[PDB]
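Q: A reviewer asked whether we had any structural model of the full assembly, not just the individual parts. We don't, so I'm hoping you can provide one. Inputs are below.
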Amino acid sequence: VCAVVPAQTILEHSVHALLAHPRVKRVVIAISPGDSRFAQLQITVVDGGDERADSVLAGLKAAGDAQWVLVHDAARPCLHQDDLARLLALSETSRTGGILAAPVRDTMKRAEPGKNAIAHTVDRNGLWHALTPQFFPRELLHDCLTRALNEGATITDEASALEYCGFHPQLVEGRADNIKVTRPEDLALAEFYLTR
Amino acid sequence: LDVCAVVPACPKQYLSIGNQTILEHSVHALLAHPRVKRVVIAISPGDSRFAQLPLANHPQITVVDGGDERADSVLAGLKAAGDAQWVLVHDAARPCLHQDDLARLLALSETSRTGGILAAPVRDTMKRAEPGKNAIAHTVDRNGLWHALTPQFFPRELLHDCLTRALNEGATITDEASALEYCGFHPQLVEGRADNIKVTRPEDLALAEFYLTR
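A: Here is a predicted structure for the entire assembly that you could use as a starting point for your response.
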């Protein structure tokens, strides 16, 4: 199984956890133009695209003989091996693949369109926070991404590409601590969280 | 005008983070704002630990018992709201409530007719499951999707009626804002800090403590 990562220095954390696995022979990273940082830090390098989906496909060429691919957010460092394992143990049951997801606990509201008023309460049953890594058959992913990018469909995660093409990925519960740092405070929390 | 806060009924509010219980952290946060004159705390028939808290002898707190249903415990609390025309409904296990957030919320009495609730936007990709299986049915749109938080602020008489109607009609109430929803009312969403959590699981303790730290 190969690992693709569309891209502080969380990156190393995210990767070392991917690598922390035995069944994860190599990690294909991706770097957009104008990126000098990377050279400072089973690792390969590919020239990413403009879209997330571009880079994933970009990295797809370096995947070798892997029939399964693992995509992982560059800003998600609180991933546990117990979670990774629970996830990778899909290739021997999975037809389409699946992703690490976390149940919703609080109650949620959908806003009235174009207004900050509450339209109605959203059902908590079967609602999940999509997380990563994402695990699916190599070529499969590649073809759903191809099609998705072509039909110009809205894509968020790699699961969304498969979904787009009819497929229904699998939901593998993972910890909630496994977060993504996008704000100037998620770091403090991500730090606290990754410290066991 | 004066605001009366109401705390509706294996809960974790009586556990302690530092020298006070979660409940006290929550209540302190409400009393801290000059508009909140009193706090009606609604307890459960089988809860006797509350009478063991200094918070019980506080000039501004009042206890009431409305059973274990929160809609009822809240109706019980309104009876004790005195003259408050607007009511703040807040969870007992939300210790981290911030002042900048509370104020932004109270401003609503002067702006909306239906009140509003604090809430934090959804930042991650959300998936809906296929009925009866851990397989994705389709992706749920996060634009306009929110996490409900408390406090929740409404005019007193409106909340009373909606709760009353919702109960009288078997509505499926979750929070107070969902009873107004059930009544054709659409409360305003005010944005607050996500660190405003509801401590329900043991791992929630450390996190709540990590946030209470400054």
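A: Points you may want to mention in the reply: Chain B is about 25% helix and 25% strand. Residues 1-214 of chain B form a domain with the Spore Coat Polysaccharide Biosynthesis Protein SpsA; Chain A fold (CATH 3.90.550.10).
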